[PDB]
């Protein structure tokens, strides 16, 4: 329920919610949750 | 219907790509079912027996439309064999005379009536492609249009990126009263102007879809059945000029029917001279399919076929201009000492005498130019000769040869491809023929009683036919979700027997 | 058998025997194997190179007849294209046969009003025919080997 | 050899994960899993 009433939030956030996956000190694989700058994303998806 | 399965399974296997796979074949399930309805319609069983006469001839060149093109194959073939007979004077059978030398003298009335059997033909061959393929052309391009319109918003939250002709071409059909004429969804204007409306305007669009907001509700309110003769001005006053404009456009942009109409324009051309009629030879590379098969070999690679050439064009001009600043002397190809013929005393006739012998030469311009024993240049003149053999004639004829060979090689790979993907891995799930086979014949089960797409075509088909409040609830699911274009019911890397593995053990 | 009989009728006929190398040797039958497995696309290919060729005849007896005199004595010229059976007979046997296509075997154009024109007609014939479709051919053996 | 190395290129990258290294019949055992795993899960481009 929280999820769907955030819907909107998560689409508008969605292409800077950067998301990886490491093997942390716990020797396990862990999720990390970080933020794409706009100017980031740009600056990647510049065609050179 | 097999072909157009063939061809479908050819195509997603190679250039599909897995995320599509299910639109994908959606859709060709759609055009199946349109071209179903096509064939159904044109199956064998004043105004009035006018009508009737002209659909029964409409119908029978939709029929032998394939049959109509092997003949006039066939008419073509017979007028150059005939045309093989021609032969040119001087006098009649400083003008020259050009007439058919002939013992029989029955070739020449043959040739009349031949040319104008083959016209005809050419003329109903183009009848019968408008009365049988350009239907299942107008379909796809409403169907696109629609969806693009209703789940892209393509005219209303975005715009045609104005190198898009399709997309500028197809802004003139949006607000035509016939937008939807051989797409089954008719209410592709209210789903649009419903979920768009709110945002964008109603009466905006209602203007771009030129939708009558005011009699929108009257006629859900009661029912208007008008009974119109069949009379020609009736006709012509019900005739959406701007639709018919659109559809001829894109039917003057489908590339088959450009093909009917030039070999219709060059039948006509054969009338005014008969060797014209020598271009419908090469309608063989169409006609028969192992002659298409061989010439996408030399096609498959054609861009790089053209730069070769041009590369060749290139050095060749490189070379021209050193036989030009040092080479002149040796190209004196006259026999009289009074009047010598130099090739290479101009820059334009010295690249023409290149290009056009010493790349037909056998060993290249040294073959061809004067030979320079004893010369204070002999050895720049041999270097010369020789780099030009084994640059131009050695290595850039060996590239061109190599690209036909490696697209020959590529085809082979891609068919040889598509048939292991087919008899591995099952078409709608995925999952690999090794999992299922640990049954007797459990991949060929899995795939012709478990997981057929024939059956989920035919499953489509009967939930369009049956009544929706007669739908069961899975019957009901499925219609849910085909009308709301998701394809999450197709199972992927899923079955059942992978769901109730232990229990079926 | 029936070849061995005609072998008595005249001895050459036992020439046809030799053929027997490709059914007997194992390896000369897989190399013809390479040969036999697109037959039917050379056969293709053959045909297409003869379309192609009434096409050149086509354009040069209407065009390039001028050109087609095989004769040195001036008093009896030998025009090859002054019909279109002769024509196409010229062409399929000189010209494909020709290193150069059919402008090594045709007259030299240069100095004509057609200079241009006929100089395209021996280059697109060169290309297609001599350099094109005979790397067909060779690229089809070539596949039947891999 | 140029033809098979683009093509031995283009099905490593479409058979197997860039980072982790694990195939694609793996992920696949979900629905588009190879596609969520390479887009959301394991996105090298993430990673920059
Ligand atoms: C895919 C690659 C395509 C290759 C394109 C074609 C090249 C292939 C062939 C090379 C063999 C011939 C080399 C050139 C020798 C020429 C003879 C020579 O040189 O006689 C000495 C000259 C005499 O001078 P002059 O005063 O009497 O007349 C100058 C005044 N005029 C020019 C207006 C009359 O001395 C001089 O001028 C000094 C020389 C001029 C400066 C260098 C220009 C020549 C360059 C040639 C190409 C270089 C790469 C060679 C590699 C081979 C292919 C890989
Ligand atoms: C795989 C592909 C196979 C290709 C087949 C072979 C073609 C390859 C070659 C092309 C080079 C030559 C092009 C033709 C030029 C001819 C010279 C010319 O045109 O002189 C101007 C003429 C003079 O006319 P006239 O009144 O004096 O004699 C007319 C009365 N008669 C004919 C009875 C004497 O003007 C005219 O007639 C108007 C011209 C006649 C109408 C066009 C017919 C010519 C078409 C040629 C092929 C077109 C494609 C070209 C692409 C190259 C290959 C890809
Ligand atoms: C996209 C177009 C290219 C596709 C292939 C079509 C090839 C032909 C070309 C082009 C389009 C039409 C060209 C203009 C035609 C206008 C008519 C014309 O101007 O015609 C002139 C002469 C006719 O002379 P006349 O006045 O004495 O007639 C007697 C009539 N009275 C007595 C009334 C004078 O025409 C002649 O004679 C020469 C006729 C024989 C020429 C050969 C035609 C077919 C064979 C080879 C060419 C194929 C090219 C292959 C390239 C495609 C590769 C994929
Ligand atoms: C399906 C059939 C084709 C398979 C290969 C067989 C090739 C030969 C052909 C065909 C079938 C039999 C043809 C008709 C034979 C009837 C006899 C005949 O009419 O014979 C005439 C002359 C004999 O003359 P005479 O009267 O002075 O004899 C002296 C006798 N007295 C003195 C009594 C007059 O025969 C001669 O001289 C010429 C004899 C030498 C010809 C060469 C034979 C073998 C070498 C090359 C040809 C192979 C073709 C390869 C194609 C297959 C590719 C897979
Ligand atoms: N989901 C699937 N449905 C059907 N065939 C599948 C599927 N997945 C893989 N296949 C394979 O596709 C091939 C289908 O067979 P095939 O096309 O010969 O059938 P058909 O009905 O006789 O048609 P056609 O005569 O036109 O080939 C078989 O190899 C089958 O194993
Ligand atoms: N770890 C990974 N990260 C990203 N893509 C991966 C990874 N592993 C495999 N792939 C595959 O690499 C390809 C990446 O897609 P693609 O390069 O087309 O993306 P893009 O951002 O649109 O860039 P481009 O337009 O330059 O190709 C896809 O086939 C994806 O499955
Ligand atoms: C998906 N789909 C169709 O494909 C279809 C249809 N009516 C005809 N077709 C062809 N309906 C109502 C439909 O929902
Ligand atoms: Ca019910
Ligand atoms: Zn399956
Ligand atoms: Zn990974």
């Known amino acids: 329920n929280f999820l769907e009433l955030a819907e909107s939030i998560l689409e ?37 | 219907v097999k072909e157009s399965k063939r061809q479908f399974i050819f195509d997603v296997v190679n250039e599909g ?23 159904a319609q044109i199956s064998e069983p004043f105004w009035g027996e006018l009508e009737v006469q002209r659909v029964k001839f409409l119908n029978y060149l939709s029929r032998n439309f394939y049959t109509l093109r092997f003949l006039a194959l066939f008419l073509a073939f017979a007028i150059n064999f005939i045309l093989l007979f021609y032969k040119v004077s001087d ?31 050419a003329f109903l061959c183009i009848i019968g492609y408008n009365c ?43 607000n035509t009263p016939s937008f939807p004429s051989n797409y089954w969804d008719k209410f592709v204007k209210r789903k649009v102007l419903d979920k768009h409306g709110d945002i964008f305007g109603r009466e905006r669009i209602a203007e771009l879809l030129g939708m009558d907001l005011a009699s929108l509700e009257i006629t859900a309110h009661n029912e208007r059945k008008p009974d119109p003769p069949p009379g020609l001005l009736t006709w012509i006053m019900s005739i959406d000029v701007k639709y018919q404009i659109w559809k001829f456009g894109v039917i003057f942009t489908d590339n088959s029917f450009l093909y009917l109409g030039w070999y219709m324009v060059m039948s006509l051309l054969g009338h005014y001279n008969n060797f014209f009629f020598a271009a419908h030879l090469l309608d063989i590379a169409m006609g028969v399919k192992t002659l298409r098969t061989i010439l996408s070999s030399v096609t498959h690679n054609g861009k790089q076929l053209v730069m070769t050439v041009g590369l060749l064009a290139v050095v060749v001009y490189l070379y021209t201009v050193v036989a030009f600043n040092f080479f002149r002397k040796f190209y004196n190809k006259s026999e009289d000492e009074d009047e010598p013929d130099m090739k290479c005393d101009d820059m ?72 292991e993907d087919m008899e591995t891995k099952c078409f709608i799930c995925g999952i690999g023929s090794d999992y299922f086979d ?67 053990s």
């Open chain 1, 12 to 48: 508008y956030f969605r292409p800077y919610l950067g998301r990886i996956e490491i093997m942390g000190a716990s020797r396990r694989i862990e999720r990390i949750y970080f933020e794409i700058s706009e100017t980031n994303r740009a600056q990647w998806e510049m065609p050179q």
């Open chain 2, 17 to 39: 790509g897995e995320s599509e796979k299910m639109e994908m074949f959606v859709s060709f399930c759609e055009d199946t079912i349109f071209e179903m309805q096509i064939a």
């Open chain 2, 91 to 121: 006098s009649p059978p400083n003008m020259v005379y050009y007439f058919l030398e002939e013992s029989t003298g029955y070739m020449e009335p043959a040739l009349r009536c031949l040319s104008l059997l083959h016209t005809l033909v």
């Open chain 2, 132 to 174: 049988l393929k350009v239907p299942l052309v107008i379909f796809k391009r409403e169907k696109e249009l629609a969806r693009k319109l209703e789940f892209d918003g393509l005219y209303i939250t975005e715009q045609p990126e104005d190198d898009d002709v399709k997309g500028q071409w197809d802004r003139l059909v949006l």
């Open chain 2, 348 to 419: 334009m006739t010295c690249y023409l005498f290149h290009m056009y012998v010493g790349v037909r030469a056998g060993g290249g311009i040294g073959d061809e130019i004067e030979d320079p024993a004893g010369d204070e240049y002999e050895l720049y003149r041999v270097v010369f000769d020789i780099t030009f053999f084994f640059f131009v004639i050695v290595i850039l004829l060996a590239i061109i040869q190599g690209l036909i060979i490696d697209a020959f090689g590529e085809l082979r790979d891609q068919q040889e491809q598509v048939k």
């Open chain 2, 438 to 504: 640990t049954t007797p014949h459990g991949f060929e089960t899995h795939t012709l009683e478990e997981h057929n797409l024939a059956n989920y075509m035919f499953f489509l088909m009967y939930l369009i036919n049956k009544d929706e409040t007669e739908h069961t609830g899975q019957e009901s699911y499925v219609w849910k979700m085909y009308q709301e274009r998701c394809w999450d019911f197709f199972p992927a890397g899923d079955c059942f027997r992978k769901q109730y593995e232990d229990q079926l």
